[PDB]
Amino acid sequence: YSKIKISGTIEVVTGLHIGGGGDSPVVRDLQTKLPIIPGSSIKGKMRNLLAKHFGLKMKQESHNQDDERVLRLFGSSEKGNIQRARLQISDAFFSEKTKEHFAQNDIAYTETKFENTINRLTAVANPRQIERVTRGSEFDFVFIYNVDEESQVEDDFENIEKAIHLLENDYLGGGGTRGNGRIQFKDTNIETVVGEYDSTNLKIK
Amino acid sequence: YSKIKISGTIEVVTGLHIGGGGDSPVVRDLQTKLPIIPGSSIKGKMRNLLAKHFGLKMKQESHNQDDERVLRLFGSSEKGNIQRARLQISDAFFSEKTKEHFAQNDIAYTETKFENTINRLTAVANPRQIERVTRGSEFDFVFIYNVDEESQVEDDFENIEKAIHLLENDYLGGGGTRGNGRIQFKDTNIETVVGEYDS
Amino acid sequence: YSKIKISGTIEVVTGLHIGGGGDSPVVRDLQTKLPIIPGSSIKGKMRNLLAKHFGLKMKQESHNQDDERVLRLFGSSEKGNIQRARLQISDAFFSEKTKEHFAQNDIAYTETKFENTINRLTAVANPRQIERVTRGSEFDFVFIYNVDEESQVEDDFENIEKAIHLLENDYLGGGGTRGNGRIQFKDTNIETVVGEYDSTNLKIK
Amino acid sequence: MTFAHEVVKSNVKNQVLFNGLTTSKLRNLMEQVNRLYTIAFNSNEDQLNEEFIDELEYLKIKFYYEAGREKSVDEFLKKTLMFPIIDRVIKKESKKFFLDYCKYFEALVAYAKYYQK
Amino acid sequence: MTFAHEVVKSNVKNQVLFNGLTTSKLRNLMEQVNRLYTIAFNSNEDQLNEEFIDELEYLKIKFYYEAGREKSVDEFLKKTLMFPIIDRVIKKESKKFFLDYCKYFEALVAYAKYYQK
Amino acid sequence: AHEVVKSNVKNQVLFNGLTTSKLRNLMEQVNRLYTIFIDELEYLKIKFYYEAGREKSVDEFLKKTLMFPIIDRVIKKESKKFFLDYCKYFEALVAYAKYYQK
RNA sequence: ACGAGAACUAGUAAUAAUUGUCAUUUGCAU
């Protein structure tokens, strides 16, 4: 029984707009009043993509019962099966380097972006204001892996690196079709924090 | 499941004004203090121009129901049917060589235009200002295509080809009517990144 | 017969949801109206994870008969070989330092993060809202350990060290896999409150 | 002033409530009210903090802002005598009256939440 | 205090507001004040850093710019004593007074928004 | 910054009738340099001489601000931060000139 | 020299488990 940690950083490529708290604000902490990326968002997005990579039928689309191996990786424990999740995602917090960088370059943390709609056969605009996390900021994450069994660890991290690649070419957040939500991953670190397992041959791109 | 990236570079030919922040400024990244082309604007020109290039009924205009091809290629999910976007368009930024080329030659990124007003029967001259993005600068975009059905990929790519064709011959941003927005595309590159698809 | 008191503070890293009330509110004292961590939560999570550390067979899964020494530490007293419990885990209460902190800087004691669910074949979202304890909160805990057998103090504190360390890499409450409820222990203390036993050689990270 | 608590049933017209009020549009107000209810409840004495007086001022500010944003909230606040009672609670500065307002407001919120589309 | 309250009712004339003030005309000022709010909140000590003093100086510059741009904003700033208040805030160099100013200005804006065409 | 502009209001005219339309090209110069080199600062100096030549009031403006010594000391210092500080000062002067007008 | 006197309603276990605040909509007509 051991736990393998994954640490890293999300780079904000273009704008990011979670906005669970909402003119139309974004999700923010309250101890620092600096934005965060909720872990539920990351987990849901990766689960959706990695499910879509494997098989997905209409009857399978019915009630969120997914392919057996993704189920193993993220846990269902619903269909009379013993499956607690094996991969834990935490939140991401607006990092110290980012704060110092934006302080010493005098750039704000949030952009307020104005949007319009042009009505058909009407040509009249109704404006909107959408607030998004500024580009180039970095958030840090930590993941936890549990080894419920020894002989699926390599395969599970193969799945996770596939998923991370898919995220690197997808959007996380809101309105990602209209040009905000691309992210990248840097500085992956792999340690076995508790246990007697080796973290040298294992890698994530 | 697979994704095929489309990468390329757009060149502005005439004046350019996006002016989302609007004496009348232009959209800009705060992290670079440099102008941009927000993906929303490109998406809007696309949807309008492609719907017009297809059937655009007055009743369909009233009810905002769009043509099935255009809708699948850009997603609506407004009529109670599931329709997720199959094509996502991102922001776009200056490329490096443009930055260098303007840095060396003592060229700015903005041109301020006086528009002189002459009023009928009175001809009272009140000058106005508008800001523009310097012609000859090129922006770098990425389009990300999501593949859901292995056969109609080709048709969707062809529709994107007519997409770019129309957009080149029309105007993007503001002042499209008065001579502002004519941009062209170069160095398009296609490269499947995830999956085992031959593209 | 001596008793050793263990004291410290729990610092919330990411929002915590014990929330035994079920909208979806958190457990609160009825004299202060502030969130609490029931001691049953600490005891149960330590029980479970330190059990899953050692051997846990299917036949062991069936009966809640667990490893002999985890059982010794936490007591079974169910069938046959009875063992009275030995470590008493108390509740944790919202500290006065953090109370002054959040009162002064005008920070809420609870956030209501809104979450969503994208079901398949329909993509129709159905929202939900969850209360979570704000990070930077500090809870004050007390443990009491009874020395029923003198020679076993070292092993027992070794195992509780294992428990603390493993808990710091896990969650309390719900939504643990969704980001919620990671804790750290800080400013620990060991002192002999009753008896004639020295507690200088003792440490808990 | 309890007729102001049961006016909510007198305002079920034809069907929308308070002309389309939803409790969802009351969320910021509910959050602030809960915050200062907890803070007041922990307080010992009846005499409120001067900073707590400023807090109540911030309550009126937020009430006016919400009444400005939405018309249904505006009707709810105006006709149920919310503004005068807020001023009055600010005037007496006693804890028990602030709790009395809190119970009235919570009763309003719950009873309104009973009926929603 | 809430001089904002009775001032906003003193500026309702015949209807124009501050000779036609509208909420769209204060967006930039609201943004700048919000950013200074969050930066100062991030600060620990009460003594204002010289960099935050320079932020206050640029904020004063921006009030003056906007007041030169439009006449109604000029009348609003002039009668609401924004300029004297900012000068005193810069003189005091205390964070708590800056937050109090933030609350005042927020109340001003909220009233201006609740009374609109 | 404020002090000079508020105190150069003589009897009402500002710097004997200064109006920002006369400062357009200088404003564009400062904005272009703000976006971004010693020689660029040199031609910058030259353009203050240029616009101060176009109108007498502008020459008096650049004199009563001590613009020329400030720019010389900027070019000596060659530090990016201090040039941006100069941009802030120039922007403040322009804003206060805009406020105090006919 | 009281139908008395001895006598812990005690021991074992938590609010858990899967759920993305999303899906479309040109800062637009001089």
JSON list of C-alpha atoms in Angstrom, two decimals, chain B residues 19-103:
[
{"chain": "B", "resi": 19, "resn": "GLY", "atom": "CA", "xyz": [-12.33, 47.86, -30.42]},
{"chain": "B", "resi": 20, "resn": "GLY", "atom": "CA", "xyz": [-13.92, 45.54, -27.90]},
{"chain": "B", "resi": 21, "resn": "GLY", "atom": "CA", "xyz": [-12.58, 47.60, -25.02]},
{"chain": "B", "resi": 22, "resn": "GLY", "atom": "CA", "xyz": [-14.48, 50.66, -26.27]},
{"chain": "B", "resi": 23, "resn": "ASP", "atom": "CA", "xyz": [-10.84, 57.72, -27.17]},
{"chain": "B", "resi": 24, "resn": "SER", "atom": "CA", "xyz": [-11.62, 54.48, -29.03]},
{"chain": "B", "resi": 25, "resn": "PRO", "atom": "CA", "xyz": [-9.19, 51.69, -28.14]},
{"chain": "B", "resi": 26, "resn": "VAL", "atom": "CA", "xyz": [-8.66, 48.20, -29.57]},
{"chain": "B", "resi": 27, "resn": "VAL", "atom": "CA", "xyz": [-8.70, 44.72, -28.05]},
{"chain": "B", "resi": 28, "resn": "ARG", "atom": "CA", "xyz": [-5.38, 43.93, -26.42]},
{"chain": "B", "resi": 29, "resn": "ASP", "atom": "CA", "xyz": [-3.76, 41.39, -24.14]},
{"chain": "B", "resi": 30, "resn": "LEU", "atom": "CA", "xyz": [-2.93, 42.93, -20.80]},
{"chain": "B", "resi": 31, "resn": "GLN", "atom": "CA", "xyz": [-0.01, 40.50, -20.45]},
{"chain": "B", "resi": 32, "resn": "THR", "atom": "CA", "xyz": [1.69, 41.81, -23.60]},
{"chain": "B", "resi": 33, "resn": "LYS", "atom": "CA", "xyz": [0.02, 45.23, -24.06]},
{"chain": "B", "resi": 34, "resn": "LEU", "atom": "CA", "xyz": [-0.47, 44.14, -27.67]},
{"chain": "B", "resi": 35, "resn": "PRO", "atom": "CA", "xyz": [-3.56, 43.86, -29.86]},
{"chain": "B", "resi": 36, "resn": "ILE", "atom": "CA", "xyz": [-5.30, 40.57, -30.56]},
{"chain": "B", "resi": 37, "resn": "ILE", "atom": "CA", "xyz": [-8.06, 39.02, -32.62]},
{"chain": "B", "resi": 38, "resn": "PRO", "atom": "CA", "xyz": [-10.46, 37.44, -30.13]},
{"chain": "B", "resi": 39, "resn": "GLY", "atom": "CA", "xyz": [-11.82, 34.10, -31.23]},
{"chain": "B", "resi": 40, "resn": "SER", "atom": "CA", "xyz": [-15.38, 35.25, -30.63]},
{"chain": "B", "resi": 41, "resn": "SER", "atom": "CA", "xyz": [-15.18, 37.79, -33.46]},
{"chain": "B", "resi": 42, "resn": "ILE", "atom": "CA", "xyz": [-13.83, 35.20, -35.91]},
{"chain": "B", "resi": 43, "resn": "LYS", "atom": "CA", "xyz": [-16.53, 32.78, -34.81]},
{"chain": "B", "resi": 44, "resn": "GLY", "atom": "CA", "xyz": [-19.23, 35.38, -35.39]},
{"chain": "B", "resi": 45, "resn": "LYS", "atom": "CA", "xyz": [-18.06, 36.31, -38.87]},
{"chain": "B", "resi": 46, "resn": "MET", "atom": "CA", "xyz": [-17.94, 32.63, -39.66]},
{"chain": "B", "resi": 47, "resn": "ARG", "atom": "CA", "xyz": [-21.42, 31.83, -38.45]},
{"chain": "B", "resi": 48, "resn": "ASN", "atom": "CA", "xyz": [-23.02, 34.81, -40.15]},
{"chain": "B", "resi": 49, "resn": "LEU", "atom": "CA", "xyz": [-21.19, 34.42, -43.46]},
{"chain": "B", "resi": 50, "resn": "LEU", "atom": "CA", "xyz": [-21.70, 30.67, -43.66]},
{"chain": "B", "resi": 51, "resn": "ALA", "atom": "CA", "xyz": [-25.37, 30.85, -42.79]},
{"chain": "B", "resi": 52, "resn": "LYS", "atom": "CA", "xyz": [-25.82, 33.48, -45.49]},
{"chain": "B", "resi": 53, "resn": "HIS", "atom": "CA", "xyz": [-23.91, 31.29, -47.94]},
{"chain": "B", "resi": 54, "resn": "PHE", "atom": "CA", "xyz": [-26.43, 28.59, -47.13]},
{"chain": "B", "resi": 55, "resn": "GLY", "atom": "CA", "xyz": [-30.21, 28.81, -46.83]},
{"chain": "B", "resi": 56, "resn": "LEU", "atom": "CA", "xyz": [-31.24, 31.70, -44.55]},
{"chain": "B", "resi": 57, "resn": "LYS", "atom": "CA", "xyz": [-35.03, 31.85, -44.28]},
{"chain": "B", "resi": 58, "resn": "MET", "atom": "CA", "xyz": [-36.87, 34.81, -42.78]},
{"chain": "B", "resi": 59, "resn": "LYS", "atom": "CA", "xyz": [-38.73, 32.38, -40.51]},
{"chain": "B", "resi": 60, "resn": "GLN", "atom": "CA", "xyz": [-35.43, 30.65, -39.72]},
{"chain": "B", "resi": 61, "resn": "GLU", "atom": "CA", "xyz": [-33.93, 34.08, -39.01]},
{"chain": "B", "resi": 62, "resn": "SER", "atom": "CA", "xyz": [-36.81, 34.85, -36.64]},
{"chain": "B", "resi": 63, "resn": "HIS", "atom": "CA", "xyz": [-36.51, 31.53, -34.79]},
{"chain": "B", "resi": 64, "resn": "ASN", "atom": "CA", "xyz": [-32.66, 31.47, -34.77]},
{"chain": "B", "resi": 65, "resn": "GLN", "atom": "CA", "xyz": [-32.71, 27.90, -36.09]},
{"chain": "B", "resi": 66, "resn": "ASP", "atom": "CA", "xyz": [-29.69, 27.48, -38.34]},
{"chain": "B", "resi": 67, "resn": "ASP", "atom": "CA", "xyz": [-28.92, 25.14, -41.22]},
{"chain": "B", "resi": 68, "resn": "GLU", "atom": "CA", "xyz": [-28.06, 21.58, -40.24]},
{"chain": "B", "resi": 69, "resn": "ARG", "atom": "CA", "xyz": [-24.59, 21.62, -41.84]},
{"chain": "B", "resi": 70, "resn": "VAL", "atom": "CA", "xyz": [-23.62, 24.95, -40.28]},
{"chain": "B", "resi": 71, "resn": "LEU", "atom": "CA", "xyz": [-25.08, 23.93, -36.94]},
{"chain": "B", "resi": 72, "resn": "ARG", "atom": "CA", "xyz": [-23.23, 20.62, -36.75]},
{"chain": "B", "resi": 73, "resn": "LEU", "atom": "CA", "xyz": [-20.02, 22.34, -37.84]},
{"chain": "B", "resi": 74, "resn": "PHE", "atom": "CA", "xyz": [-20.35, 25.00, -35.13]},
{"chain": "B", "resi": 75, "resn": "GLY", "atom": "CA", "xyz": [-22.88, 23.75, -32.57]},
{"chain": "B", "resi": 76, "resn": "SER", "atom": "CA", "xyz": [-26.10, 25.35, -31.35]},
{"chain": "B", "resi": 77, "resn": "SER", "atom": "CA", "xyz": [-27.89, 23.20, -28.72]},
{"chain": "B", "resi": 78, "resn": "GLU", "atom": "CA", "xyz": [-30.67, 25.77, -28.58]},
{"chain": "B", "resi": 79, "resn": "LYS", "atom": "CA", "xyz": [-33.69, 23.86, -29.93]},
{"chain": "B", "resi": 80, "resn": "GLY", "atom": "CA", "xyz": [-33.66, 21.09, -27.32]},
{"chain": "B", "resi": 81, "resn": "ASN", "atom": "CA", "xyz": [-31.41, 18.80, -29.36]},
{"chain": "B", "resi": 82, "resn": "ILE", "atom": "CA", "xyz": [-27.90, 17.86, -28.24]},
{"chain": "B", "resi": 83, "resn": "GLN", "atom": "CA", "xyz": [-25.35, 19.75, -30.36]},
{"chain": "B", "resi": 84, "resn": "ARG", "atom": "CA", "xyz": [-21.82, 20.18, -29.01]},
{"chain": "B", "resi": 85, "resn": "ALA", "atom": "CA", "xyz": [-19.34, 22.23, -30.99]},
{"chain": "B", "resi": 86, "resn": "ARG", "atom": "CA", "xyz": [-17.24, 20.10, -33.32]},
{"chain": "B", "resi": 87, "resn": "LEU", "atom": "CA", "xyz": [-14.86, 22.95, -34.19]},
{"chain": "B", "resi": 88, "resn": "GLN", "atom": "CA", "xyz": [-13.24, 25.22, -31.62]},
{"chain": "B", "resi": 89, "resn": "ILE", "atom": "CA", "xyz": [-11.47, 28.44, -32.56]},
{"chain": "B", "resi": 90, "resn": "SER", "atom": "CA", "xyz": [-9.00, 30.03, -30.18]},
{"chain": "B", "resi": 91, "resn": "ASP", "atom": "CA", "xyz": [-7.58, 33.50, -29.75]},
{"chain": "B", "resi": 92, "resn": "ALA", "atom": "CA", "xyz": [-4.66, 34.64, -31.88]},
{"chain": "B", "resi": 93, "resn": "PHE", "atom": "CA", "xyz": [-1.52, 36.64, -31.26]},
{"chain": "B", "resi": 94, "resn": "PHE", "atom": "CA", "xyz": [1.40, 38.30, -32.97]},
{"chain": "B", "resi": 95, "resn": "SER", "atom": "CA", "xyz": [4.11, 36.06, -34.36]},
{"chain": "B", "resi": 96, "resn": "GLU", "atom": "CA", "xyz": [7.74, 36.57, -33.45]},
{"chain": "B", "resi": 97, "resn": "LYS", "atom": "CA", "xyz": [9.07, 37.81, -36.78]},
{"chain": "B", "resi": 98, "resn": "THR", "atom": "CA", "xyz": [6.40, 40.50, -36.95]},
{"chain": "B", "resi": 99, "resn": "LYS", "atom": "CA", "xyz": [7.49, 41.69, -33.51]},
{"chain": "B", "resi": 100, "resn": "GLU", "atom": "CA", "xyz": [11.11, 41.86, -34.64]},
{"chain": "B", "resi": 101, "resn": "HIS", "atom": "CA", "xyz": [10.33, 43.48, -37.98]},
{"chain": "B", "resi": 102, "resn": "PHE", "atom": "CA", "xyz": [8.34, 46.28, -36.40]},
{"chain": "B", "resi": 103, "resn": "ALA", "atom": "CA", "xyz": [10.91, 46.71, -33.62]}
]
